[PDB]
């Protein structure tokens, strides 16, 4: 039995939990309660495994298990149509199936928050199920979330009702640490969106590339030898949790941190305060643990990598492990890098030695690669250093409406929403790491824009559009900031007619919390230069400066919300002949 495998390792508690985050991960339309039923039968059953390892069918594959039982409420089509197919599917691919219709942005309504005294008292009358609804409302609407992480964030949770509920103004207790999680959720989401894509998009050498760049990063005194175990471990991890095998990941996810804090000495030694705490916190903690110092005395690359004679024969030995070699000694002594660029670097090499080696005198030939290098290096340095300074001058309120326009000019076939949360996103890269020192603004910037594209680019995969971010998108995923950076503007865009229905605009504007605000101005500006791209320059500034002129206004008049129609077609008036 496998059930009675896992069972025994994660035990009822995180067992539960995991089941519950797989089911909800899969069928994210289907409500609360039914999960919770699946979820215990399914727990019962498992129960029985643990004695009798024969039973019912306690003999075959959590999938076959796992399948069956959504399958008994999949197949109403008349709430999941497309769902019935996969129902009707063997046991080489149902499981495909379902993976294959995952949904990255569910039309699940907004998850508003009852006032602190309702869910004070709803956790802590019944806890389990306050915790479960929690799991179960984010596994939901982030398929791909890290589950392992999940609980850590879960317990975490916990402990923010669990104190602020016996403050003195629970309000002011919680809201606070609410709001640090909804963030921290959405990036360690984010973090794992791209994490599947490569691996699923661009296959397990790719996934394992980044792996080693960004381990020798972190690990600079490991050796390669060791480095590779780890790579091989994490990426098996995040093959099984990207698949929809959540209890498998949890599991060797625990295997992989009990290993890597016995052998601490061996990998690094700021280690050491991870692996003194609760497995969850042990977990997350390694994940996130600063680099180690680097190496003193450390040979220069062009020693074993250019200026050898055996470089040629070696690549032909074992291209793979040389690469991967090279890689790991380039990473180890520039944590200063981002992951990405090490990653271009290396693509570098590779494609030099392999012209190079079919040569009359590959030596001759390969002896001046590092000469690239520098442009490669460059490019982003100065990007970082020139919209760092820009940031620093408007903030990021303008800094965003700053690259609404530009994004949308370089895209203009892109969805509003997409751009809007897109744009917004690749500002907060400003505050996020513009106050760093040069030697860590890369690293933070670039990686960062990596994970925010690859949004757009599995956003826009759902529906195609534009041509131009397919192919930046599908291309090279190592290439993908560099190539956005390149697109200027789209020249066989055809303008759109403003409509009314394109825009409406009820008072109902007049509650929403001030972010919603600034974001229905950006939404606007987005609009507007989809409606006129070429004749834009200031204009488009006085205008926003206008907008912001109505709300404040009209938020402040007396008549029936009358005014935000007569004078919303007004407005339309003025906005035309500009």
């Known amino acids: 039995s496998e059930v009675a495998h896992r069972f025994k390792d994660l035990g009822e508690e995180n067992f539960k939990a995991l089941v519950l985050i797989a089911f909800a991960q899969y069928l994210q339309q289907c409500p609360f309660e039914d999960h919770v039923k699946l979820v215990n039968e399914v727990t019962e059953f498992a129960k029985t495994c643990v004695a009798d390892e024969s039973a019912e069918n306690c003999d075959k594959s959590l999938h076959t298990l796992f399948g069956d039982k959504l399958c008994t409420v999949a197949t109403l089509r008349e709430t999941y149509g497309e769902m019935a197919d996969c129902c009707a599917k063997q046991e080489p691919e149902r499981n495909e199936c379902f993976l294959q219709h995952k949904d990255d942005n569910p039309n699940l309504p907004r998850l508003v928050r009852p006032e602190v005294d309702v869910m004070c008292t709803a956790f802590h009358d019944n806890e389990e199920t306050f915790l479960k609804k929690y799991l179960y409302e984010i596994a939901r609407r982030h398929p791909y979330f890290y589950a392992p992480e999940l609980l850590f964030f879960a317990k975490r949770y916990k402990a923010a009702f669990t104190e602020c509920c016996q403050a003195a103004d629970k309000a002011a207790c919680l809201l606070p640490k609410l709001d640090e999680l909804r963030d921290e959720g959405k990036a360690s989401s984010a973090k794992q969106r791209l994490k599947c894509a490569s691996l699923q998009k661009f296959g397990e050498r790719a996934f394992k590339a980044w792996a080693v760049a960004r381990l020798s990063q972190r690990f600079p005194k490991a050796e390669f030898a060791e480095v590779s175990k780890l790579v091989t ?124 080696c079919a040569a009359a005198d590959p030596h001759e030939c390969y002896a001046k690669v590092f000469d690239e290098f520098k442009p490669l290096v ?134 929403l919390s001030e972010k919603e605000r600034q974001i229905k101005k950006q939404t606007a500006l987005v609009e507007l230069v989809k409606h006129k791209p070429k004749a834009t320059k200031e204009q488009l500034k006085a205008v926003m400066d206008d907008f912001a002129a109505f709300v404040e206004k009209c938020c402040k008049a007396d008549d029936k919300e009358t005014c935000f129609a007569e004078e919303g077609k007004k407005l339309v008036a003025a906005s035309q002949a500009a």
Request: glycine fraction near 2%.
């Open 233 to 356: 471990d994490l990426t098996k991890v995040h093959t099984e949790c990207c698949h929809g095998d959540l209890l498998e990941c949890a599991d060797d996810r625990a295997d992989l941190a009990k290993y890597i804090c016995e052998n601490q000495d061996s990998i690094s030694s700021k280690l050491k305060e991870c692996c003194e705490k609760p497995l969850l916190e042990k977990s997350h903690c390694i994940a996130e643990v600063e680099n180690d110092e680097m190496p003193a005395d450390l040979p220069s690359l062009a020693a074993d990598f250019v200026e050898s004679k055996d470089v040629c024969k070696n690549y032909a030995e074992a291209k793979d492990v040389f690469l991967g070699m090279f890689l790991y000694e380039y990473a180890r002594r520039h944590p200063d890098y981002s992951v990405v660029l090490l990653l271009r670097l290396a693509k570098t090499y590779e494609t030099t030695l392999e012209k190079c």
């Open 378 to 511: 460059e490019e982003p340095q100065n990007l970082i250093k020139q919209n760092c300074e820009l940031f620093e001058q408007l903030g990021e309120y303008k800094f965003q409406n700053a690259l609404l326009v530009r994004y949308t000019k370089k895209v203009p076939q892109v969805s509003t929403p997409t751009l809007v949360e897109v744009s917004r996103n690749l500002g907060k890269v400003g505050s996020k790491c513009c106050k760093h020192p040069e030697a860590k603004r890369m690293p933070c910037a670039e990686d960062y824009l990596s994970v925010v594209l690859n949004q757009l680019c599995v956003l826009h995969e759902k529906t195609p559009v534009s041509d131009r971010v397919t192919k930046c998108c599908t291309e090279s995923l190592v290439n993908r900031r560099p190539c956005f950076s390149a697109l200027e503007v789209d020249e066989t865009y055809v303008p759109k007619e403003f409509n009314a229905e394109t825009f409406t605009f009820h008072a109902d504007i007049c509650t």
